[PDB]
Write a protein that binds this ligand. Structure first.
Ligand SMILES: CN(C)c1ccncc1
Length: 149
């Protein structure tokens, strides 16, 4: 699969993260991100996708070595970490044909796994509207501990 790039944006207290909600197959909440174009650099893809989905320009804030990268089913996703963005920033997507809503979420209240269905003696996982964000949550909490305290 083609690699994806985007951002984990936090506010000034470091408590809250910015998620976006799409439609249809992307109907839950996730970090803003998308597919890299031919010959496009990673930092430039991350700024472009984030500006298309939120209207906020990260280009002056990106730090090259401050990101979390995961490989999921053989596709690579890298999210640059962007702290200290004020909670009263006004966000607006380019087209609301792609993005339903944009909200701040408390980091400590978000799940870092889905729940099983062992009460039903049934295999698999229950649905969760944060399914796209979940894989990054534990690594993010660990990264904030190591780099802030
Ligand atoms: C600023 N903010 C939280 C939003 C703006 C645009 N769409 C939804 C929410």
């Amino acid at each position: 699969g083609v690699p994806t790039y985007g951002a984990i944006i936090l506010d000034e207290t470091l408590e809250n993260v910015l998620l976006v909600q799409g439609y249809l197959a992307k109907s839950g909440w996730g970090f803003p991100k998308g597919k890299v174009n031919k010959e496009e650099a990673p930092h430039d893809c991350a700024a472009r996708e984030v500006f298309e989905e939120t209207g906020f320009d990260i280009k002056d804030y990106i730090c090259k070595d401050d990101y979390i990268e995961l490989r999921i089913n053989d596709q690579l996703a890298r999210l640059y970490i962007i702290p200290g963005i004020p909670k009263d920033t006004k966000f607006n997507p380019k087209t609301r044909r792609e993005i339903r809503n944009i909200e701040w979420f408390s980091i400590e209240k978000l799940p870092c796994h889905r729940n099983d269905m062992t009460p039903k003696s049934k295999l698999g996982l229950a649905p969760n509207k944060f399914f796209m964000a979940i894989p990054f949550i534990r690594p993010l909490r660990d990264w904030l501990s190591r780099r802030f305290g």
